[PDB]
Design a protein around this nucleic acid. Sequence first.
RNA 1: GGAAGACCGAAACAGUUCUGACGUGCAAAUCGAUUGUCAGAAUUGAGUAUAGGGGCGAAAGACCAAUCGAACCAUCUAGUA
RNA 2: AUGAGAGCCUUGGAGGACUGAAGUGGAGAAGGGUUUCGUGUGAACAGUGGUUGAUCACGAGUUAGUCGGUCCUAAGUUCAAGGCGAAAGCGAAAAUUUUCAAGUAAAACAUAAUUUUGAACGAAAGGGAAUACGGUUCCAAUUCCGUAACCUGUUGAGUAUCCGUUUGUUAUUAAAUAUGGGCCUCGUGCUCAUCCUGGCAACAGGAACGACCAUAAAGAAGCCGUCGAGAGAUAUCGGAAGAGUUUUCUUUUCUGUUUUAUAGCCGUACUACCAUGGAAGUCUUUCGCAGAGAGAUAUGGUAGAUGGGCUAGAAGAGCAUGACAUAUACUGUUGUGUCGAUAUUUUCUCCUCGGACCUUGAAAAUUUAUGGUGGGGACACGCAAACUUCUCAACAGGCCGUACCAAUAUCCGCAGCUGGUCUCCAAGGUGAAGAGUCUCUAGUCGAUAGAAUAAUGUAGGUAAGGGAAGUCGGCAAAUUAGAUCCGUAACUUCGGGAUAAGGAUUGGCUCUGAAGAUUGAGAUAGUCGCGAUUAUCAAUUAACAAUCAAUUCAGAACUGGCACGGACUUGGGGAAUCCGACU
RNA 3: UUGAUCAAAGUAUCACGAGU
Lengths: 103, 51, 91, 50, 70, 152
Amino acid sequence: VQRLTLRRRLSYNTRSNKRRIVRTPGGRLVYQYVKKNPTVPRCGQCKEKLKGITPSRPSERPRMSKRLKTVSRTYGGVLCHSCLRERIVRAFLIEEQKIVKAL
Amino acid sequence: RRLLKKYRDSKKIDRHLYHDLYMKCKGNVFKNKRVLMEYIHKKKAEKQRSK
Amino acid sequence: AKRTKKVGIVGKYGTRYGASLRKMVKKMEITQHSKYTCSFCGKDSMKRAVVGIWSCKRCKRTVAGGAWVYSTTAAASVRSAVRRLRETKEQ
Amino acid sequence: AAHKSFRIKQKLAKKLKQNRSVPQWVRLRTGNTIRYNAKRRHWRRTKLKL
Amino acid sequence: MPREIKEVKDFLNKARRSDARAVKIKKNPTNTKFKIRCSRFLYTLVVQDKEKADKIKQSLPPGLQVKEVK
Amino acid sequence: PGRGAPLAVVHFRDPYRYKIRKELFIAPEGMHTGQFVYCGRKATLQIGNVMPLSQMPEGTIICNLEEKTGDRGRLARTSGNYATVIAHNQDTKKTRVKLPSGAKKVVPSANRAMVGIVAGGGRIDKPILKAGRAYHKYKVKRNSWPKVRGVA
RNA sequence: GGAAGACCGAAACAGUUCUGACGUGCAAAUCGAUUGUCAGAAUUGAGUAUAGGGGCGAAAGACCAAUCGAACCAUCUAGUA
RNA sequence: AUGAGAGCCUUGGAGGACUGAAGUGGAGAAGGGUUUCGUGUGAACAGUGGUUGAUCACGAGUUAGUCGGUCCUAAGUUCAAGGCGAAAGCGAAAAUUUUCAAGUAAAACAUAAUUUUGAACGAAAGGGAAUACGGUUCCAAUUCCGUAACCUGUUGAGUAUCCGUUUGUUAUUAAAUAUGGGCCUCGUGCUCAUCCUGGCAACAGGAACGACCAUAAAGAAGCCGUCGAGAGAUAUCGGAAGAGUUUUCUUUUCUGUUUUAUAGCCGUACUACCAUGGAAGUCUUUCGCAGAGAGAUAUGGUAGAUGGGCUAGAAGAGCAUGACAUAUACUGUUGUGUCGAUAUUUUCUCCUCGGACCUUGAAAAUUUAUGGUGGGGACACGCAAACUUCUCAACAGGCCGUACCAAUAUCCGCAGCUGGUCUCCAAGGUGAAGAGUCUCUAGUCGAUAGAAUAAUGUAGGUAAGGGAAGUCGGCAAAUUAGAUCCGUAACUUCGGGAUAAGGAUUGGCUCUGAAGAUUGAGAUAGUCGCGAUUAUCAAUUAACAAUCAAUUCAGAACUGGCACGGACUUGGGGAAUCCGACU
RNA sequence: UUGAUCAAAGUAUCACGAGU
């Protein structure tokens, strides 16, 4: 083995130095450094991950295109399709109920 | 539990001889693979014989 | 096999704290750590999340309840008793 | 070190030039009883603290 | 280089640009790679038949300064 | 973290602004998510709606009761505890409740209270059993330490 | 299957015995073997917070810069004997 | 070899050793403050010496849009005087201080529902825009040079975007991201219209009204365990190329074979959704019990890819090796760089599911989506547009830190003090093991040196016979110890006691047996000309027949002071009393 | 029943006209 002098002057084992071991072209075994893990949004009330969109960090979302961070339908990157399907037929029924109750 | 998925998916064992035979695999009573091969040369000929 | 005879769940605590102080904590470790049967879903998956907060995994209701049981018997009279006390008040 | 202020590298600049021998000529001025530099600090012998 | 191209005129397209200072070519025993230094990127066209090389070699903006390794 | 009884994140509409106004309540027992709570005077008696003491009839049990009429909820707030409405009076509107010490107070009859016994009880019935469960019990409350006996 | 202020033990943290070394030391408390703990009421850094008839204390009148049955500093002060 | 003088460290060659990857190794934090690095050198200092030196003298040396600060807020400092105090000032989670607001291209006749706190600090380990490789110095390097990228900001130029019809074109068509429609003499006439499209669905593509109010999300996370994926390493067996060794024998024993960011594309495992469908004779599936009429198994698909494979980078990049060749300089050049496979949280990272809890495990900056009323864009014979959330191009990026030590000699302990002082990387062997002994890479032999081996010592051994008689007391020492199999008492809180006790076994050599993986094997009839060419299933079928891999477990012969845990590592045990429950 | 709401619709009278 060689063993690794790190590159930055922060020597502790924090989350802000995650790191990996990579062979260079010189065959010399350095550290590259690992960024925190990008993630996919959560649902409104399912609180589970949304289908459709690539994982991101908040700094990398300004350099994206719109379809990478939402889906297509109404309440796209906000609601899961099942909750919206609930939110439609709840909202349709109660406006429907508020007619026949009011007559 | 891999031999068994080889023995459903070829055809050599019914489904009803899985949730009998999974649960005797999960549960100690099969020492080798070779004994389980010989409750399919044994518990299989009877169902053909009774048929 | 019957791994124990008496102690059951509190064998983890074993030979410490006193016999009749570990007879009592078994009451509340069998009742906590338990799947109850969900009253909205019907499928028995309702474990406790924290002290007093019970949550069911499939179809995600969270219901506030007792500290180790899911529904205390002091509450379970009152949940009925206010239902009797309401029907004599509207009418 | 390696992580110092601007004010601390400026004061440690100054204490690096006050750390000098006496010039060889001022021993020869008329009525110059400067024998040695008297207030020469030394890195392991006196620290700074000050 | 982070880019290669596939279509051949596209490689000729970027050669006639207001950036794109110089073009490098590299013979291999298998193929011959063409590389064009652009501003933000650098584009590789690789050809492997040894006869379309000098075909696409001129085919050239003449004021584009070549780099030549043989 | 530090409490004994769960809290409920109810949110209502603001009536004069366009905001959804999120509210922490002391959760009465048997309050799932997605329940409608009906906080007001013309509400009906079911747990845990809040409604003033005047409307709800004698014999009911309440929690998160108001002490002075409008002060948001002081009396009987810990897990398992409750206060029965024991009597009324139409003369000067003063309602006797019975508090968890047994001391029977005379609160006035317009202060709000949430009907039902507060969830998360009764938790004092199981031994802490260890001293590293009292260390954990108090490291999120305060430094009523290991208390040494002062005779020593 | 893999719970537990459960077990033996490494790193660490502690300091039982030798009443071993040493005892004008290597050291104004260390050296050596022997021991105690080791997944927790765990061990640690950094930023903070508490100031002297005060603080902090799982309590020994322990600790609060080799200082503690009352810190340290200057003064009253060349106190009085 | 120096030099007046050499046991040092003075150096260089042989050299025998130590540390031994939890180092006497390589780097950082705090601290130091020039000790750093060259050239010199007498005294002093270096408790011996000294030609040497962390000393002395003189010259030098720290390069950033990407590494850090700086930016955000934590605990807290609490900080407009409304207040208080003779003042100074204040054990101030203020709780009252007209607007005590943070505010908006917002209309009239104090912009409108609105915000109670002002204001600021506080983290070179938390939050956070982005860079990596090959080279280079006596001294600096993610900072310079080389080459290939990127982020933030401002600016510029292309980019849904021209219709029916008919200008091209007889029409079909073609510019045109789409037209139609009645009428009419067809229409040339009239009129009508683009804030894009696909997929049943999950969702998909190059873009495709943020200027607000509102909601949701990301930021935003502990702990312990965890199937699986890959990295890195180490490791056998193969190619190659060059070294090692030749008492004798060894197709040997060894080194080396590499591919950074950034991209493009394929891409499949895994989890969850979508469609068809309807499940008891219940089936699915994990090491683990997880699911299913609230839609299972199936068949097809979508999402995510963190995972790799290709190919750009990649100049045989460069690199590394090994041939040459050139008095030689900045040298020209040949040739290589290739297969398979096994292994562990000896280590990171990704993913999955769990577990404990009277413990339930940060906030804000910043970002993003979607929802909303009103407002803008909005002609079709087009000219275009597009804070365009697409592509491309220009330009710019200030301030401050950056050397070196990090300790048996740069720090603190008055000192070159055996003490202390936070982290990161981590080889082979045997072994359960980051243990203990030995070694490889790097690193040292510096602890004042020679002679001699008296007494007493400090430290370590052994000792006939007896075995505690010694002693306050078995203090000190001695014994036992790993592993497999047997076996286990009083008492008990039923959990333990317990490794109770008490026994047996173990080396070497040559064998045998058991445990798995991918392929199935593939009868049968004929063609072409044994070659070539064309497929169903009863059974097969346990190391079926091949091929491949793992190291554990059970035996058996033979065998030697019968010394076998041969070093190391490594409980003496039992019967009681008294105290504290236990950690 | 785990939807949704903000920012006037209508109305009347005047401005009841300006450009035309």
